[PDB]
Design an enzyme around this catalytic site. Structure first.
Site, short mmCIF file in Angstrom:
data_model
loop_
_atom_site.label_atom_id
_atom_site.label_comp_id
_atom_site.label_asym_id
_atom_site.label_seq_id
_atom_site.Cartn_x
_atom_site.Cartn_y
_atom_site.Cartn_z
N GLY B 11 50.05 36.68 51.76
CA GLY B 11 50.49 35.31 51.46
C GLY B 11 49.48 34.28 51.71
O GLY B 11 49.75 33.07 51.80
N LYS B 195 32.83 46.70 43.34
CA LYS B 195 33.16 46.39 41.91
C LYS B 195 32.45 47.29 40.90
O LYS B 195 33.09 47.80 39.94
CB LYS B 195 32.91 44.96 41.65
CG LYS B 195 33.94 44.13 42.43
CD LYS B 195 33.71 42.65 42.51
CE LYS B 195 34.76 41.88 43.32
NZ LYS B 195 34.24 40.56 43.53
#
Ligand code: NA
Ligand code: NA
Ligand code: NA
Ligand code: NA
Lengths: 331, 332, 331, 332
Positions: B11, B195
């Site tokens: 969150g 990545k």
């Protein structure tokens, strides 16, 4: 009486506790002959609520060359390095809690460590004696060193013993302030490896390379693995080891099965255990993480400096291992 | 109308951007016949001011098995892994931005990626098309791939060109939200490595190991090195490369001297450049970090799922490189 | 379906609750034919923890002329005024909770209020109906209006009745979010006076001047004064009154002794009581402060606008008072 | 060595600056034979991050009667008043920065000010000498007094000269800490009025009423008005004036057109300018807002007290003006 002008780098939990501790103990410092005067506190966001008066905060780098002392508790390596180097080249000492910095930028930092300009008790086991513990152990020669050096992974293991899951325990560790939002360095053993490197450099090899430490974290461990250890009269802990092998020093971090009554297994907090010739077997325990515990170490180092004592020196030359004597069970 | 039941893990900057983006777009979601309903949002500190309703906050792990989707935007590997695995085992898809999780826990996650259960566009270049961009590039055989994948290290080099110091730029990168308090993974090239691994797995080898990427960050660079490059007609960037050497695919992350007019050197944002046969030379650029940018990718993946399309699949087999290649020169 | 582009000014407790309420109710808004798109949120410190995504925050003024709507809940008068005027001149409506603004900048703002561009239900009694309550009361003519319009001073009085001191109660009011660090506007009756002005302009005199309100706060009151009232079968409250005197409307704020069973004395929350011809006696009660209560009012106004209804208009012309009829006991 | 027992009311920007300044200066305080000991610090929200130890925080009012000093830096009038009165009644001094308290609760506070129990240097121009400056000016008879007393409105005009808008400057004044979230008291001239009243009481009339000051803020001013003043060789400032009219002292706060070379126009900070007979023309400038600046004044007063000197006394009688005067022209 003189002014001690301090540049603080970092205003997080550590930097804030160190600020407040310095002012709360300014009556002690006057007994050492100084009055503490913070020049400024380098912070990331200066408008964030923070336990330091807002006007002392600096969002940008400021000149350190006027400071009497730099105290650093920033994250990471290259940015603090670039910030501290001009101060160190000017002969200004550094007190730091930044184990990554010292472990990973030692090519740059060793010459200043050798000159007694770098104080870093707080970089291993926070304000628990660790560097000073090994400075006294230098009377002897090391046979074997085993530590439980990271707070987060101790906490998580202790909780998983009680049947808390990894994730539950981690979330808790994050609220207690042992672990960051991304706890990777903690839980992969890398923080233990940085600290182990520093211990090695002080006691056995002033060139010990961080890249030689063989580190494994706690990812294979579960409450089941731990409960079964307990059934075997064992505890599992992430241990940082330094030992001789084929004539050289080897360093490893890994989960290890300990006898349950071993000092490492029982310890109140993080712990360092050594067996040395001729002293024998010695041990130190205490908190290894947290703002107040770390600030204690930084402040012990500031008193060390104020008393006239130099910083933590690397070993003067690599020592020869006596035992090739090389221990273990992994999990 | 039916509920699309979402469990959200995280969150913070991303998870809050995502949550508010979903609420914004509820009208768009009704066009699939659903209304978004969050089962819970896992957060570290429920007391912190947050643009998510207090009653949905979960300080402890919660049961995921009623969800239609798990969206994850936590940090680190092991805890997310252990949280998501039971949902994946139950056939619940995962939408994630967590490049480290995918790069480092692939032994556990690969089987589920192979079944179409893992959506991860936001794990590379945020909501800029990268995974979909390679999905389309599958129509060709790869010759070479070169990307500028990390937002923080692009930003810091861009600033250093202009005369800023590393530390000044870093601090601003942190205030902008590209880099955390400890930016080690960014600045040591590890985020770009993570990545790069995922791009390799999609394109050329579904088992490509993270540990095989050779990575080196920006720590040797200064404003003066970058200014000397500029006087030679070059720009220095941290580049992630996939290329053939000795009949094997090699993956590296390092500072490279680029011609100043190269697409990679002139990039508006993070960038992915690809020569492949028979297509030719293709390129994509856009923001590769940020809360909103990341949430755009997460939401793209939610729509992909809602539209009936499966997640991002690994390459169906490994294969050797078609040609022997080479990155740009490194920095002396 | 269309986009509703919103510029929000202020990201405090009100602005944050309104942001989150708008997105949480976006399913309602689609029934009204729109999707809410915040352009940006003007805030004082954009790096402060805040219940709004950080990237939407703006430390500096931004162009409003592209917005479909401006929503304002900033402090003060002249800065919001200067920010909103170019939007109002471009025919962009304003929804505001800023009673000071409207009370004190009415020379600038009245012409836009007359055109139906300003919605301000939330500026009096938060999302409790107050402006709308008086819009329906316009069917009748006012004989007397008495309100309990400020949340802080109601809270403090209620607590002082129970024997809490002023200071204790104020500190509490500050933690609950009724009062700011400097509560002067609340406790001197000035906030009640701004709100009373606005009520007057809607119902009885579209030019009513804020400067004519006679305001006294709660500074003479103590738990003793209040306990003795109670002994006399009374309660003491800070009341905002509007009544005719010598042919004109008069407005006053002051502590008043009420019968203990009067609706004003009993009310669940802030309250507005009126006696009007020919309707008779009517009353409205509800929360008059707090983020969620205020956001409710702002959102009611956004639905009002989306439905095609204009903003809150001033009275079309000053009305003549019927009763000179002019009440009271002070304390 | 003995304890100097301090009750501190307020732990915000000022109260925290003051607390940390006291700790910094403990060595200096030992030169009076004391060590500073805080009985408690009154604060609104004990959970907020604060540079004061949690164990000294008090969310509710606490007994003051064991203190040697009460230092107050709360906002507003009535609550501080009711908190300090029992300490003053017990003969415990008050050190305060609260110009509103003093201006508005003088009926209650005057008797104690007359006994030397109230120290308030920080209530006007923060730790810049202002009250002590007038104490010394008592050696002459006042002809006229003109001051630029509010930090926020000086800052905003300074910025508007440079082309900034009011709202831009305000927001920065707020980020700098000159102005609160609601800056009405600053920008409407009321803070300068409060300060002006206190200067009047010290110098010329110990009963001077706050309500008699005529005050008007900066709301009619814009970058264009200030630029036209500049082309006429003027600067516009908000000025607080005390001067004789019709045999009575008149106090006003308003925008005034100053000659650009006037000391008041050229002020480094807030400023107080005074012609008096026989001294002549004297002037003092320095910061008139800010946490540290305010804490300097509070601490100056603590030292004044520790050194054995009493607080700031009102004028011993009222007296009429010696000459008829006039402020600068207002703004058309
Ligand atoms: Na230590
Ligand atoms: Na992407
Ligand atoms: Na209302
Ligand atoms: Na002063």
């Amino acid at each position: 009486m003189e002014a001690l002008k301090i540049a603080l780098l970092g205003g997080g939990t550590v930097g804030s506790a160190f600020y407040n501790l310095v002012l709360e103990r300014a009556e002690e410092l006057s007994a050492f002959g100084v009055v503490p005067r913070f020049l400024g506190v380098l912070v990331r966001d200066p408008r964030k609520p923070r336990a330091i008066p807002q006007e002392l905060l600096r969002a940008e780098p400021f000149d350190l060359l006027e400071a009497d002392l730099v105290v650093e508790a920033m994250g990471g390596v290259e940015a603090p390095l670039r910030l501290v180097l001009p101060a160190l080249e000017a002969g200004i000492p550094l007190i730091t809690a930044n184990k990554a910095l010292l472990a990973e930028a030692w090519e740059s930092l060793r010459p200043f460590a050798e000159e007694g300009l770098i104080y870093h008790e707080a970089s291993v086991m926070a304000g628990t004696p660790a560097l000073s513990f090994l400075e006294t152990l230098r009377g002897s020669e090391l046979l074997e060193l085993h530590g439980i050096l990271n707070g987060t992974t101790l906490y998580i293991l202790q909780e998983m013993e009680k049947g808390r899951t990894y994730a539950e325990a981690l979330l808790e560790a994050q609220r207690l302030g042992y672990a960051e939002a991304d706890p990777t360095l903690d839980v992969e053993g890398i923080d233990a490896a940085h600290k182990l490197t520093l211990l090695a450099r002080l006691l056995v090899d002033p060139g010990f390379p961080f890249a030689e430490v063989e580190a494994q974290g706690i990812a294979r461990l579960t409450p089941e693995v731990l409960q079964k250890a307990e059934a075997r009269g064992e505890r599992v802990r992430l241990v940082a080891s330094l030992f001789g092998e084929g004539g050289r020093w080897r360093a490893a971090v890994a989960p290890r099965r300990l006898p349950q009554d071993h000092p490492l297994a029982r310890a109140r907090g993080n712990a360092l255990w050594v067996r040395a010739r001729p002293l024998g077997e010695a041990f130190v325990t205490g908190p290894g993480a947290g703002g107040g515990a770390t600030a204690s170490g930084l402040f012990a180092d500031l008193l060390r400096f104020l008393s006239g004592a130099p910083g933590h020196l690397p070993a003067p030359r690599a020592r020869p291992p006596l035992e090739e004597g090389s221990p273990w069970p992994g999990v």
